[PDB]
Design a protein around this nucleic acid. Structure first.
Lengths: 225, 70, 66, 129, 88, 259, 156
RNA sequence: CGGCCCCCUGGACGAAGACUGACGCUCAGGUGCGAAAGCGUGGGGAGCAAACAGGAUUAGAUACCCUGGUAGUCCACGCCGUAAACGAUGUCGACUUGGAGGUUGUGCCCUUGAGGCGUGGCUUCCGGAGCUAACGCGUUAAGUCGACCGCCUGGGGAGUAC
């Protein structure tokens, strides 16, 4: 679906510097221009397409997708992507054992929900100023952490990831439980934990956005189906 | 560290210059080193140990730096 | 940033006193290869040259001596 | 010094399997070639290809099923230090028949089962599983 | 070490082709000459142990070569040992 | 296919290493960080201070194109050296243009000599030149109306280390660093030098054709010890510095900044 | 349907400012009497709790083992840390000839007939692990055929 | 093994070619080299310094500290044959992901510049798979193998007695 030219324009073909590479990414690498590794778009594209297809399929059976990206450059974008296809996301720091330790995190989620309710639906007001402030702070904290996953209910049936090396904890968790992983994997990253590897530039913003958008579209399509 | 006071130069300035020169020479340090006999082994050990320390400072710390403190 | 690599000299000359004088201290000492940035191979040669000069009283062993 | 070429070859093969190498090249020898052929027949490698005139290079092409390697184990048995010769009744069964034992007999190098069928034993080269 | 000219001369004499140089016999001759040369040195310098190691090694090599020659071709070996005056 | 191989050598052909090809489009602005994309592996974290012109406020919105620089790749994550140096090459080209007709004409206005040559400033940048260059004769711009308008006629340039002394008024008129290290020597010759890296004891301003200066921590200001040089000056900025000391032997020119 | 055997329970200590804090480790193993086996190692201040924890652990992260009838498919070695273990398939009637922790794992796995020696260390936790490894690695005839690009009759 | 110079001299590495044609690897006994101290004979003796002497310190101080100070350290020729003689890791060969250096060659390239792209030798650090009781080792293995040798079999008694 996503063309090669577009990818090139975005800056998918660019990778990291040669000294920071992983030799498990040697198949997906093409060459090294100006001492910086170039990802092979001929090998990338089909894989990407396959991944997209898989995602679509998942969506079709009413699968829950989780969008992970805690880089802070593409935190805004990932959330947007998630919301477009009304799916869940973790745009700020992944809580260690979010999925493996769901049952504890489910309590946190509940608490957050309660807080939200108190804030909005109650309309009681009349609260001690320090206490109120504290409550507000707590709410903020919760929202930041678990805003995207509050309506997830259980565990997701697939896990889309913007960087494998950065979100290794998440990936690891997904492997322990057996959730399918769809990781964007730059040359420095490790592809071994990832099920459906996508060789591409995690760092560049435009590229990331592109990666998101197609995925979102596919999810939407699946839903429609 | 031979020095000559320039025409219309302050005393203090001259002194400072002299001190600087001395520092550059590493004369005091040298003297300190030759106060007592260092066994060859000891000398070796210090040199290697120092080198190791330097290496540690350079690389490990750099690695640490990549990650933010707060 | 070595001089001798750029010049492309085959061997450093003890007679070439001026050149040597750039690599010797105000106190007479030979200057480290960290500071000058001389290449290792050349540095040794330079040192040797300096030593030779000192033997021939072309360069001084030290500032104080007389 | 190089003392056991077959052993070396085996080792190379093992390393290839470990490291997920597609093909493994080495200096060719007749015995080695025979061994390779046997392996191919028994289905532990994809294909072997000798190439060269003066100093020819045997190139095996290793096999991988469902990610992992095919040659699970591969040991020399006879070795220059200590030779092993078996009579047709004393011929082994590698992995209770699931693996193979390359055995050099008077009628050429063959798998243990083949040797048994023939009705002859010999020098036991290697177990492969 | 052995001077170039001397080496060349040695090669020419013992070597069949004179371009050959690597002939066993030639090699032996070369070794032998070197050994002879070093004898003088070592008479003078008895404590030069490091140098003597090299000499020893050379001698060993020569011996090995001789042995090799013997098994291969006896007559040639005999001739060689007549020429050089090697007791064995 | 070989579509991609050919596309790779094509994209090699349509970029170069320095800040030469004005290619990065400014794709997000936020104070205090600009960011472009010149067809590199990542986006630059640009300062705002490489892009405000001569009075302090920004000049370029979204889509605008300046080249940056290169030859340094990956400090962890990111891509460039700053585009402002880019600009230096353009300045060099204009200075070079003189050679063609033996006269580069702009405006040069030089009020005074930090180190023996009036300072001339062209557009945003200000440069320092040797003392003769400011005036054609012995006219001296001290009697001229302050920060006067002429041009610059070049008197002297040092060709390696970048010091250019230029000719105000009089329109009618028309190994290597260390042997002869006596030019900026004599006691206090002021220099204009860009700082490079501040090593918590130092600042490392070093400009004059392959040398190293320190301005370590003791002067820097008029407080001694509590100063921490990163707070007090900058990173990458051309400043007031002069020599105070040269050892041509243990190459330590020890500059100062309290002057 | 699942059978679960607590192999060992061991008291372990942690020294603190006051004195010694004691705790209990429970090593259990569970299986369905067919291929599926899983050991669990649980820890708690009281024994029963620890045991429960171990059981819970066991029940998740199980592992499948190809069993030719009541016995193994071929002799198999398994190692882990000190404990190196040999186990050999055996004729119907012979029973589980194996010692200690090793026996328990076998029993749950639904091997009925084995000849099994534990060389090296016999530290229950390690030895059970070793046994598990051995079981896991053990390939079937069908599997081998699949691997090699042959039929089952070609392999025999 | 360390100032500089000369004379005699051993090894290593690279570059191409040319030649020899398995001549190789390992090695019980055997032979040699083997820090420091130590011994013998003859020289030498500045500094340093076992022993020794005095002064302190101390409950004592046959030590640490101070002031002196002789063997010895230095040279010649002999002997001794041991050291945490350590990488606590036998030698030789083959094979198995990477990164950052150092040093010393060498091929090409507009050396347009201190550079660019390789290719050899030796070497420091980090780390992957794998290995390991763990610590760690990790293409210079403690990984995967082969050849030969050396050595271990609870602590003490004892590397002692005869």
């Amino acid at each position: 679906t996503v063309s090669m030219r577009d990818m090139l324009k975005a800056g998918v073909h660019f990778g990291h510097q040669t000294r920071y590479w992983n030799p498990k990414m040697k198949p997906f690498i093409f060459g090294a221009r100006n001492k910086v590794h170039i990802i092979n778009l001929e090998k990338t594209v089909p894989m990407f397409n396959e991944a997209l297809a898989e995602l679509n399929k998942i969506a079709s059976r009413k699968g829950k997708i989780l969008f992970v990206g805690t880089k802070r450059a593409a935190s805004e974008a990932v959330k947007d992507a998630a919301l477009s296809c009304d799916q869940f996301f973790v745009n700020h720091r992944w809580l260690g054992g979010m999925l493996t330790n769901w049952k504890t995190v489910r309590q946190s989620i509940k608490r957050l929900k309660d807080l939200e309710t108190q804030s909005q639906d109650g309309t009681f007001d009349k609260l001690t100023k320090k206490e109120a402030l504290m409550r507000t702070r707590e709410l903020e904290k919760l929202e930041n952490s678990l805003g995207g996953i509050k309506d997830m209910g259980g565990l997701p049936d697939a896990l889309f990831v913007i960087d494998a090396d950065h979100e290794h904890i998440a990936i690891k968790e997904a492997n322990n439980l057996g959730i399918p992983v769809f990781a964007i994997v730059d040359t420095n990253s490790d592809p071994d934990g990832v099920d459906f590897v996508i060789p591409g530039n995690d760092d560049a913003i435009r590229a990331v956005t592109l990666y998101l958008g197609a995925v979102a579209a596919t999810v939407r399509e699946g839903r429609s189906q | 560290p031979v020095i000559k006071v320039r025409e219309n130069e302050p005393f203090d300035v001259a002194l400072r210059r002299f001190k600087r020169s001395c520092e550059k020479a590493g004369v005091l340090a040298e003297v300190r080193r030759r106060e007592f006999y260092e066994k060859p082994t000891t000398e070796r050990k210090r040199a290697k140990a120092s080198a190791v320390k330097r290496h540690a400072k350079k690389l490990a710390r750099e690695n640490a730096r990549r990650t933010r403190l707060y | 940033f070595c001089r001798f690599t750029a010049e492309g000299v085959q061997e450093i000359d003890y007679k070439d006193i001026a050149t040597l004088k750039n690599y010797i201290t105000e106190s007479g000492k030979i200057v480290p290869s960290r500071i000058t940035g001389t290449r290792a191979k050349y540095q040794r040669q330079l040192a040797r040259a300096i030593k030779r000069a000192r033997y021939l009283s072309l360069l001084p062993y030290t500032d104080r001596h007389q | 010094s190089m003392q056991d070429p077959i052993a070396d070859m085996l080792t190379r093969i093992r390393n290839g399997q470990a490291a997920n190498k597609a093909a493994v090249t080495m200096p060719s020898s007749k015995l080695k070639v025979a061994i390779a052929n046997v392996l191919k027949e028994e289905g532990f490698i994809e294909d072997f290809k000798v190439e060269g005139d003066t100093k020819p290079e045997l190139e095996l092409t290793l096999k991988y099923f469902q990610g992992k390697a095919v040659v699970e184990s591969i040991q020399r048995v006879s070795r220059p230090g200590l030779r092993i010769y078996k009579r047709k009744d004393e011929l082994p069964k590698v992995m209770a028949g699931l693996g193979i034992a390359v055995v050099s007999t008077s009628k050429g190098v063959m798998t243990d089962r083949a040797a048994r069928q023939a009705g002859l034993g010999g020098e036991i080269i290697c177990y492969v599983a | 070490s052995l001077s170039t000219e001397a080496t060349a001369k040695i090669v020419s004499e013992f070597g069949r082709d004179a371009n050959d140089t690597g002939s066993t016999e030639v090699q032996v001759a070369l070794l032998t000459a070197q050994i002879n040369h070093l004898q003088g040195h070592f008479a003078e310098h008895k404590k030069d142990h490091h140098s003597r190691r090299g000499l020893l090694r050379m001698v060993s090599q020569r011996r090995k070569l001789l042995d090799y020659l013997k098994r291969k071709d006896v007559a040639r070996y005999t001739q060689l040992i007549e020429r050089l005056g090697l007791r064995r | 296919e070989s579509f991609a191989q050919l596309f790779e050598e094509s994209l090699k052909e349509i970029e170069t290493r320095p800040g030469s090809i004005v290619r990065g489009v400014v794709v997000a602005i936020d104070k205090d960080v600009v960011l472009v994309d010149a067809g590199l592996k990542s986006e630059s974290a640009i300062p705002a201070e490489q892009f405000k012109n001569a009075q302090g406020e920004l000049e370029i919105q979204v889509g605008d194109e300046v080249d940056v620089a290169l030859d340094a790749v990956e400090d962890g994550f990111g891509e460039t050296l700053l585009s402002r140096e880019k600009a230096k090459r353009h300045e060099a080209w204009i200075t070079l243009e003189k050679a063609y007709e033996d006269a580069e004409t702009v405006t040069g206005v030089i009020n005074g000599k930090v180190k023996g040559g009036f300072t001339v400033e062209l557009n945003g940048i200000r440069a320092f030149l040797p003392g003769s260059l400011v005036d054609v004769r012995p006219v001296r711009d001290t009697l001229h109306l302050e920060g006067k308008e002429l041009e610059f006629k070049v008197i002297k340039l040092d060709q390696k280390r970048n010091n250019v002394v230029v000719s105000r008024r009089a329109v009618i008129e028309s190994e290597d660093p260390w042997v002869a290290i006596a030019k900026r020597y004599p006691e206090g010759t002021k220099l204009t030098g860009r700082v490079t890296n501040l090593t918590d004891y130092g600042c490392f301003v070093e400009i004059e054709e392959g040398v190293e200066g320190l301005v370590h921590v003791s002067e820097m200001d008029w407080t001694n010890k509590n100063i921490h040089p990163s707070k007090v000056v900058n990173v990458g900025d051309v400043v007031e510095v002069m020599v105070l000391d040269i050892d041509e032997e243990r190459r330590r020119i020890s500059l100062g900044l309290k002057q | 349907e699942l059978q679960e055997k607590l192999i060992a329970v061991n008291r372990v200590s942690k020294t603190v400012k006051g004195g010694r804090i004691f705790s209990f480790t429970a090593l259990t193993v569970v299986g369905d009497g067919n291929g599926r086996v899983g050991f669990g190692y649980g820890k708690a201040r009281e024994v029963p709790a620890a045991i429960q924890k171990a059981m819970e652990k066991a029940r998740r992260n199980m592992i499948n083992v190809a069993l030719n009838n009541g016995t193994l498919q071929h002799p198999v070695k398994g190692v882990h840390t000190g404990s190196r273990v040999f186990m050999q398939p055996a004729s119907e009637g012979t029973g589980i000839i194996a010692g200690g922790a090793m026996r328990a794992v076998l029993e749950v796995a639904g091997v009925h007939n084995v000849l099994a020696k534990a060389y090296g260390s016999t530290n229950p936790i390690n030895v059970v692990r070793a046994t598990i490894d051995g079981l896991e690695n053990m390939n079937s005839p069908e599997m081998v055929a699949a691997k090699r690009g042959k039929s089952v009759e070609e392999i025999l």
